[PDB]
């Protein structure tokens, strides 16, 4: 078993906004299968932020000192809870065996709105608090 | 007087007046127990930054040093393009009220009261 749900049925998961600095101006986007926020399923013994630096490494191939949590992000549409954190990238890695490219937050909020709005929203509250 | 550009919208300026550098709270006012951003139309001979300084002395009674525009803002329900300016406040003058505001708060009580000012404060913040 490599999933996990809450009480509720939500599947749990956990995401990270990667900051090229600690002025959090420039986030880190990957390609999808369009752009997205990397991020995935947290597992059984997991916290939170564990799940979130594994999947950082795993999706976008990147080391970083984990920050705060901005909150629990829910998609009814999907059944999803989603923590996401905010996090500064230390290490970018190799050639794998998929894209990553710096967005100014305006500009990922622009490419996010097209397609997945929710992922737009977690940079929206960050700085806006809506 | 009002002023026009040549695909007919009118011309006017409001500016978001910080109380430090650092622009995290903004000065607002009364119109109506509702909040909003100084401003108003531009004078036929008048230079966009000069309507601004004008406008919050007339509307906000503050002075203070004049910083970026942070853009124009196109209203096309009302025909208007107003350059939205920011301003550093240095001396205020004394039944309409002013009140400092938190940047994250001042989106909110706009976004209520006058939505078309709170996306000023908007694209201040994701900029």
Redesign the interface.
């Known amino acids: 078993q490599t999933r996990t749900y809450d009480r509720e049925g939500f599947k749990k998961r956990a995401a990270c906004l990667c900051f090229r600095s600690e002025q959090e101006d420039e986030v880190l986007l990957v390609s999808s299968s369009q752009w997205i926020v990397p991020g995935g399923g947290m597992e059984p013994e997991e916290e939170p932020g564990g799940a979130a630096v594994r999947e950082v490494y795993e999706e976008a191939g990147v080391k970083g000192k984990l920050g705060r949590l901005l909150g629990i992000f829910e998609n009814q549409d999907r059944k999803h809870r989603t923590y996401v954190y905010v996090l500064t990238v230390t290490e970018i890695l190799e050639d794998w065996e998929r894209k990553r490219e710096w967005f100014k ?2 500009d990922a ?1 622009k490419v996010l709105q097209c397609h997945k709005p929710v992922h737009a929203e977690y940079l ?1 509250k960050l ?3 809506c």
């Open positions: 937050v305006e909020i929206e700085k806006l608090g």
